[PDB]
Amino acid sequence: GSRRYDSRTTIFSPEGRLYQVEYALESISHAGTAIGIMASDGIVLAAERKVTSTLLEQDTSTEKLYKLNDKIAVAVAGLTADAEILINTARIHAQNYLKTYNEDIPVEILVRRLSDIKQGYTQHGGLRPFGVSFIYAGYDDRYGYQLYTSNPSGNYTGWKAISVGANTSAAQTLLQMDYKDDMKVDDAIELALKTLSKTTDSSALTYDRLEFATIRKGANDGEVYQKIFKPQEIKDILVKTGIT
Amino acid sequence: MSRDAPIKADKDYSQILKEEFPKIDSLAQNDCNSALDQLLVLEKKTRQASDLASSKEVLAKIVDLLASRNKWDDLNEQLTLLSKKHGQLKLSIQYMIQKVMEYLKSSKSLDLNTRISVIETIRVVTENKIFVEVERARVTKDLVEIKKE
Amino acid sequence: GYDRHITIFSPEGRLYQVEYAFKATNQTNINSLAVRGKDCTVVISQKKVPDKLLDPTTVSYIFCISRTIGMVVNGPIPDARNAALRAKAEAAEFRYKYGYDMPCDVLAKRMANLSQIYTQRAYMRPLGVILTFVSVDEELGPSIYKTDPAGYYVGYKATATGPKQQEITTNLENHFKKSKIDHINEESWEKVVEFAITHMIDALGTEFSKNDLEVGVATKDKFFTLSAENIEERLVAIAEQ
Amino acid sequence: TGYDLSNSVFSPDGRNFQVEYAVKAVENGTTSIGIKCNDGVVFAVEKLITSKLLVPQKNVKIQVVDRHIGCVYSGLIPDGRHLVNRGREEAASFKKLYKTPIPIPAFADRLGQYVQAHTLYNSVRPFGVSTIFGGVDKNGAHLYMLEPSGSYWGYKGAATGKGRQSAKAELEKLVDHHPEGLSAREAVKQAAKIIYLAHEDNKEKDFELEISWCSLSETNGLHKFVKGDLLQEAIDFAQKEIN
């Protein structure tokens, strides 16, 4: 009845690589592309939506770029349902640390704890593990901008550029040839939108299939300002660059 | 039904009230409806076998009136009510009733009677699906004779 | 394969446990008929001919849930006892908290929620019985609600359950649509009983006796069965008629 | 196929096939009879003497519940003892609440819930036993049988075990000849008769007759075993009848 049957996901794999985690990376690459480009003065963060349905009000509904707080924004690729739970968990964690110590949580600490929850699931949770990768674009004063990505494995790795979602290789290869260490945020805006269009099978990647955000310290009087760019503002900069 | 005292009890009951048939017959002379009333109680036997016994008495009655023109109406009307309601199935007591039905058809006694009787008789056997249709059709042909004129 | 065997959503999405449960009712072969009186709810049902080992007078199908609600159960005999507990227990629940017993509609809602839960866990399975709650509610007047193993439910003007429910439906269809009445408009409750028995005998084709019967009448602020003396007295009127 | 194996999952006919497996033990077990009589109830159970190592009158399956309900069972012997315990637990709990003996109808209702509970668990197996129980109370004599699958009914006469075929065929004719019932005293002799017809079935080993009773007039609505002169005459006289 229940004794006989098994759907143990908590077998220690013989390859050293848990099979369930393998399939969750497949599933990530079905979901649209999200690109983190780290510059000295910010993180330029941009992700295409994967729906394209006309009846569907995509405009209103942000589904990939969620602002957690002032210095930290996350781009989602993966299962949107699984993702919702981790967004509330990540929001409450940064607030609790801010309350205890009166300092915005260093980026390192936040990313680590969230990765450790994913890990926990296959450690002895009995749970299927969340099949989501998140790029946490974060700032703190000490360490500058910091860029980390997570894996369904519960492992994070820092980078100066990363891609998740579809066309991981196509995007990564362009950024390596075109991005140089010293290009500023300003360049990266122009760079991001153009590489995305070229990976995607769409003839022009419309403004309405885009989500764009930046986290910058080049906001006056030594302050940090984020702005999730609204669909029509994406459109003007879409025309300049000649995609449209 | 399930009860098996009725079988014996009722056969006995019919026979004793068949020796009372001439008493019923004299009362029938004064008032057919009163002699009819006694027979109604009687043809509410619950068991079929004793129904068959009891339905003989009813056959004998209409011969002696020879023949009624108001009391025979109630009788036609009743037989209808017994079969449609229950009869304990539409077939169960309705074979017994067939010998009762049969007598109108074959009597053919008075031209006065014959015209009137066919319209009333065929109306009853309509919606039944046993032997009655063979009889029903033949008497219909007797109105066609009248309709020729 | 496996998915199908145990409770969990099959590829098709069918719940095989539920389909089998519906076959299960018919296996008891119990037939019911319920009509709505003018001011009463009459439900009558068969009971299989008694054994000399059993006591013929015992009943175990009827259960007095509360003053308002009587219940007749069609399906697995062992599970009917199981179900009878839950209806009375939640009936009493509503008296403490909300200060009076459940209505008929409101008891059905509650059993249905419980049914749904029983299906998701493996260990728990849906009660294979089909439950027929009878009541006269005040607001709705005469009411019958039929609640299913699934957790599916709906009220009825008149209902039938069993392998030969097919025959009863056709009879009631004839009875109630042609006349054009939603329920029997006869005032005296006695003549509703007279008449529901009459339709049962007609429809399945087999005469009933005291032993098969069992007459449930629910009225405003009462559920009662008729005494054995009265059952026999209704028989005398039925035969003459 | 797979629906059967999985305990408490609907068989494709309907109802878990394990409940049917459990029934089979009860047939393989010893005869037990329960007779409703005028005065009360008379229980008899066939106790096989496999060997003389066995201690006469001392491998009773007769276990008192409260003080006025005999209980005796057939089938898997450990299963019974758990359900026996369960009856006890239930009786006492009623006396906590309501300060008076449980009625026999109420006992029959409340015992039945326990069987169903385990059989809507996949984790906890069926009971392997039919229980005959009953006694005399304030509301009179009452006889109930809890089938292995959980069903309670009134009975004029009840039987379980291998020799129920013999037991049944007699009890039907005995009720046909005596529709006004018979005293529990006379039925002590007549229980003994019935068991003898059933030991044609269980003819492999010798036996020992054990009757207990609870009667309105003669045990004064308490339950106690039948022994000494009452029991002896019952043996003696019945024997003659069956020759």
Added chain:
Amino acid sequence: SKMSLAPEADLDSLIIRNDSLSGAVIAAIMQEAGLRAVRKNRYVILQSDLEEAYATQVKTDNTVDKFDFYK
């Protein structure tokens, strides 16, 4: 064309009753209808016959099974 429809009711009657069905069903309908026509001893297919033949073939997994867990 094959056999003049009876004048019991119009040509246009057949048309109304089909509402979306394909040719294959139309053919099964017309086949049954004229079979029963032969018995009466009229070679004309009655407009009643097609009516009954159309009406039937309703089965195709009813609504009972569906509605207990898809509705």
Added chain:
Amino acid sequence: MTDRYSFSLTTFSPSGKLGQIDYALTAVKQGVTSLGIKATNGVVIATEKKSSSPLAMSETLSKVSLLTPDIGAVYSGMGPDYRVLVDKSRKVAHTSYKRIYGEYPPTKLLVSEVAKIMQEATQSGGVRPFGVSLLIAGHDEFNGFSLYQVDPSGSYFPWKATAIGKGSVAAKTFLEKRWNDELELEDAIHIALLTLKESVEGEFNGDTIELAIIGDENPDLLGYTGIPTDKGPRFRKLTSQEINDRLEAL
């Protein structure tokens, strides 16, 4: 006594994407047709509601249920799953909502709470997912009228027009053309009933067809007109007569 499962029955398929999510979805598609048009001055939600048996009361059967006096909802898929999910959703909203706010939940918020619950069913061993899609149609200050569609996958998005069930493919296309940026409350209903006729033909009595709008505010329906600046119930469940009326003005 708990099932000896200690693990998620739900596994990733070896090709990605949960088995069970796919399994649950089929039910929504198989089940009967529902459509909705979001409008600027309301929302029309419409569904077929066929007699189960003519003898069955066809009035007590419901597929419209209340979440708040402002927001109503209709589904397609498993009927018994819906009933329970509604009850959970009343508690999840109301009590907790009143404690942190003390109002009725805006539509955006209400829809998101429902999404997490669907996910937790699936994730949890011993509990198989709820396979129902609900359309939650409602009003809030800050977004005008809104329509969200909530998938059994635990994901939501708002739509101008949507349909689920068998007839969804046909319906969506018909509507697509008829939808305008500016819409009359009266026209949204005409257009809705017109399409609904094509889902299954016949039975256009307003009894067997269940129609509701999230119309305009009434202190009349509110049952107190002593201060009529209070919001009335936005949600209105239409009578059969009202529907009968709409057929003549179509």
